[PDB]
Design a protein around this ligand. Structure first.
Ligand code: HEM
Length: 282
């Protein structure tokens, strides 16, 4: 899949799209669902045959937006609709991925370089449901799962830190509760809370197991597996003790996730680094 720049567009065009998304996030407090949308639209990728991935923007098709794994992301899509209406020239893959970048940055997360040029592909290119991960599994599951995305242990642990941004909803996923204290702010608190809170393995009202802290947080079985495996645990401790290292590693892993499957020509533009609304005085 060769990246092809939307005709005649440059950094300033994409900064205008960024800003419109950023204003929407401030308006609706929809940062977390847009991060999740960027991840799910990218996370269908299979390194073995280059199916799925962010390039084709196939979430716009029924099979994918109706994936049970994507329950709730329709809200994010809906919030992007006015942006795509104002900027109809941007491809769907570019919009979904840029939505995630914008959301991380606007929630005071790291800068995430972003490259344009994803191109819409037809409905028959939509990947089947079942490529996104299960939450009821263990560290071995997680490690194996993420090999299909070409992610190693450090990349996995870093990416999972995005959980502290938001919450689980029983009706959507079968899990209920906030993942952290810092709702709508990107921090390293996922790691700190895993190490420092008092966690109990309980059943929620959907009869699924989750880990609950007295402070009112929860963790999925796959989240908690990062302190049950000794290789993951050492990285959890590293990020709990170095906010900057976490931010830099997250940025790299998230850009990689959003770019898997895409061939950027040698004369493609460099990755863009968008200014936040705060940085622009907006
Ligand atoms: C083993 C991997 C992971 C699994 C099993 C998992 C599963 C889940 C589940 C079940 C939810 C709750 C959905 C809901 O009820 O609304 C969720 C929420 C979330 N996921 Fe993950 N996730 C994984 C990895 C990731 C990664 C890699 C990212 C992005 C870097 C991410 C970002 C988020 C965000 C931001 C939310 C919060 C959504 C909200 O607040 O509405 N997840 N995840």
């Amino acid at each position: 899949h060769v990246a092809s720049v939307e005709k005649g567009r440059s950094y300033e065009d994409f900064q205008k799209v960024y800003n419109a998304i950023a204003l929407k996030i401030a308006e609706k407090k929809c940062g977390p669902v847009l991060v999740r949308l960027a991840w799910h639209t990218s996370g269908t990728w299979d390194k073995h045959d280059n199916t799925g991935g962010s390039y084709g923007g196939t979430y716009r098709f029924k099979k994918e937006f109706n994936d049970p794994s994507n329950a709730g992301l329709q809200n994010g899509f809906k919030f992007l609709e006015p942006i795509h209406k104002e900027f109809p020239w941007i491809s769907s893959g570019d919009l979904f991925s840029l939505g995630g970048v914008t959301a991380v940055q606007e929630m005071q997360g790291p800068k995430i370089p972003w490259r344009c040029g994803r191109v819409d592909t037809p409905e028959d290119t939509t990947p089947d449901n079942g490529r996104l991960p299960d939450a009821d599994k263990d560290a071995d599951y997680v490690r194996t799962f993420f090999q299909r995305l070409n992610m190693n242990d450090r990349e996995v642990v870093a990416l999972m830190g995005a959980h502290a941004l938001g919450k689980t909803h029983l009706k959507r996923s079968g899990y209920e509760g906030p993942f952290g204290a810092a709702n709508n702010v990107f921090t390293n608190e996922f790691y700190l809370n895993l190490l420092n809170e008092d966690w109990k393995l309980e059943k929620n009202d959907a009869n699924n197991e989750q880990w609950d802290s007295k402070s009112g947080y929860m963790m999925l079985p796959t989240d908690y597996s990062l302190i049950q495996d000794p290789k993951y645990l050492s990285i959890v401790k590293e990020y709990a003790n170095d906010q900057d290292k976490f931010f830099k590693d997250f940025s790299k892993a998230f850009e990689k996730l959003l770019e898997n499957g895409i061939t950027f020509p040698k004369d493609a533009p460099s990755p863009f680094i968008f200014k936040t609304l705060e940085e622009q005085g907006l």
